[PDB]
Amino acid sequence: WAASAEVANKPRLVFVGDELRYAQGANQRDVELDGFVNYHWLTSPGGLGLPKVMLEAGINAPAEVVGPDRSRRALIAIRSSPWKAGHETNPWHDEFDLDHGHVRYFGDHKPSTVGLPGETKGNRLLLEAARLHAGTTREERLLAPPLFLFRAVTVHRAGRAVVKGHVEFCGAAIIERLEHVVQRDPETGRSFPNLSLDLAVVSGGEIDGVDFRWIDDRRNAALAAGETLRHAPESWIRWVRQGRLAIPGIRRRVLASAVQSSKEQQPASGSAEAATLQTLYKFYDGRKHAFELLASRVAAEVFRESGARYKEGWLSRSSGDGGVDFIGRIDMGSLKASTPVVVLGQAKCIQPTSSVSPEQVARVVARLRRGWIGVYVTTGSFSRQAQVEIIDDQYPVVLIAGGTLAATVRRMVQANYGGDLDALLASTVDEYGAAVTHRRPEEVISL
């Protein structure tokens, strides 16, 4: 009573990546075990008076919960074992892509299995669940058991014994596709049928975790299915209510690096850098090529500020647009211990309140050979989709928006001038800017 109420009042958030302590026996009451969060306490507090949620290799599920009106499966605890990363090669291996909220899972049908798929407990559970996850009604999706994902992880807290003794939470998942597959046992050369699952890992919403009180609610026989969504992710509830169509929006999405919006890419509102940026925009609006020269100078300064040895090559054109405007070179490495890196640059003078589309960046990325990097210089900013495209696809492109451009221009004004700011602008417009070289980019290595 008081213990179960104590349980129902304390959130048990488990985040994606948390290394849980899984062990034979142990205690459902101890919150932490062997320096790690105890799995058995996390899934079954013990104050509920409920059996443990077993997490064996493959598919797991506790006994069915007989509610007052209807019965249901509480959850499905799936544990994946292999952590190959190139060590073990197999097309039937579980494929985890949690950053895009997608997991390719495989059934528990074995080469030595006598029955037809899936008469195995795991695949039977997976079929039962899949029938509910594909439900076209809210009532069928309400009964649909979530797929809690776990994997064998490696972790050395004291700097030793990282292997084994751990499991890692990988999120809650919806079955979006079930397929029958055929596999061949590489040991015996035997072809056996199996099941395979497309899993969509839902978003945690505000946080990247899941409250395991949801499981407690689903294991509560006094509660109907409709009253078990209090602590469930808003994404999951949205799937229960809207269905498959709600999946593309509720799917988990993780980016490696941070994305900066327009305000972060632009200098402050009433700053001198803002006025400077506006003067630059008013100057190079009708002057494209001089702005490309200025862009070459700016990019040069940017790469030289990072400590990299930069070499300005040439400007590609004096007319007719093009995807590449200027060429540079970066000798990455120590003195007499370096390698040449061809740098492809692109200048785009646009209104500081306007933005650069991902295809415009891709026009620069597409040129990049192996050992080449890109650089984009603009008076405006870059769209969110451009940054997402660059980060998620790992495009080797350095971004130089209105803020960095303004700062570099001001600094260069302070560098060489007579007390004015039109020194750099005049240096860009007149003289040098007319010269162009009709040579291949890679040839920048030779100069």
Binding to Mg ion (CB under 5 A) within 319-338 occurs at 325
Query: Which partner from the list Mg ion, a copy of itself, none does 347 bind, CB cut-off 5 to 8 Å by kind?
Result: Mg ion
Subset of 185-204 contacting Mg ion (CB under 5 A)? none
Is residue 348 a contact point for Mg ion (CB under 5 A)? yes
Is residue 9 a contact point for a copy of itself (CB under 8 A)? no
| Piece of the chain touching a copy of itself by CB under 8 A; list 53-61, 68-76, 274-282, 310-318 | 310-318
Is residue 226 a contact point for a copy of itself (CB under 8 A)? no
Is residue 255 a contact point for a copy of itself (CB under 8 A)? yes
Among 312, 355, 380, 410, binds a copy of itself (CB under 8 A): 312
Indicate the residue among 65 and 125 with the shorter CB distance to a copy of itself. 125
What is the rounded CA–CA span in Å between residue 34 and residue 130? 36
Here the tokens at position 393 are: 């696809």
User: Cis (ω within 30 of 0) for the bond into 159?
Assistant: no
What is the rounded CA–CA span in Å between residue 338 and residue 321? 33
What is the rounded CA–CA span in Å between residue 346 and residue 401? 12
Subset of 341-400 contacting a copy of itself (CB under 8 A)? 341-342, 357-360, 362-363, 365-373, 375, 385, 387-400
Between the alpha carbon of residue 418 and those of residues 61, 223, 269, 294, 322, the distances in Å are: 78, 80, 28, 19, 35
| Piece of the chain touching a copy of itself by CB under 8 A; list 43-51, 175-183, 217-225, 269-277 | 175-183
Indicate the residue among 90 and 351 with the shorter CB distance to a copy of itself. 90
Other beta carbons less than 10 A from residue 362's beta carbon: 17
Is residue 178 a contact point for a copy of itself (CB under 8 A)? yes
Residues whose CB falls within 8 Å of the CB of residue 185, separated by 6 or more in sequence, listed in order: 111, 191, 192
Subset of 231-250 contacting a copy of itself (CB under 8 A)? 242-245, 248-249
Phi and psi at residue 13, in whole multiples of 5°? -75, 125
CB-based contact 360:377 (threshold 8 Å): no
Indicate the residue among 70 and 100 with the shorter CB distance to a copy of itself. 100
Indicate the residue among 108 and 325 with the shorter CB distance to Mg ion. 325
Residues whose CB falls within 8 Å of the CB of residue 9, separated by 6 or more in sequence, listed in order: none
| 161 burial via Cβ count (<10 Å: 0-12, 13-18, 19+) | exposed
Is residue 11 a contact point for a copy of itself (CB under 8 A)? no
| Least Å from the CB of residue 346 to Mg ion | 5
Is residue 339 a contact point for a copy of itself (CB under 8 A)? yes
Sign of torsion over alpha carbons 95, 96, 101, 105? positive
Indicate the residue among 32 and 185 with the shorter CB distance to a copy of itself. 185
| Least Å from the CB of residue 325 to Mg ion | 4
Subset of 63-122 contacting a copy of itself (CB under 8 A)? 83-87, 89-92, 95, 97, 99-102, 104, 116-118
Is residue 289 a contact point for Mg ion (CB under 5 A)? no
Between the alpha carbon of residue 259 and those of residues 25, 386, 388, the distances in Å are: 45, 10, 7
Indicate the residue among 348 and 410 with the shorter CB distance to Mg ion. 348
Lookup result for tokens 């799995």: 39
What is the rounded CA–CA span in Å between residue 437 and residue 45? 73
Indicate the residue among 42 and 347 with the shorter CB distance to Mg ion. 347
Query: Which partner from the list a copy of itself, Mg ion, none does 320 bind, CB cut-off 5 to 8 Å by kind?
Result: a copy of itself
**E strands of 288-434, at which residues?**
310-315, 326-334, 337-348, 355-356, 372-378, 381-382, 397-400
| Piece of the chain touching Mg ion by CB under 5 A; list 178-186, 218-226, 348-356, 367-375 | 348-356
| Least Å from the CB of residue 4 to a copy of itself | 26
What is the rounded CA–CA span in Å between residue 38 and residue 185? 35
Q: Tell me the β-bridge partners of 13.
A: 211
Is residue 290 a contact point for a copy of itself (CB under 8 A)? no
Indicate the residue among 217 and 389 with the shorter CB distance to a copy of itself. 389
Indicate the residue among 33 and 392 with the shorter CB distance to a copy of itself. 392
What is the rounded CA–CA span in Å between residue 177 and residue 179? 7
Query: Which partner from the list a copy of itself, Mg ion, none does 301 bind, CB cut-off 5 to 8 Å by kind?
Result: a copy of itself
Ramachandran area for residue 298 (φ above 0: left; ψ -120 to 50: alpha; else beta): alpha
User: Can you give the binding site for Mg ion, defined by CB under 5 A?
Assistant: 325, 347-348
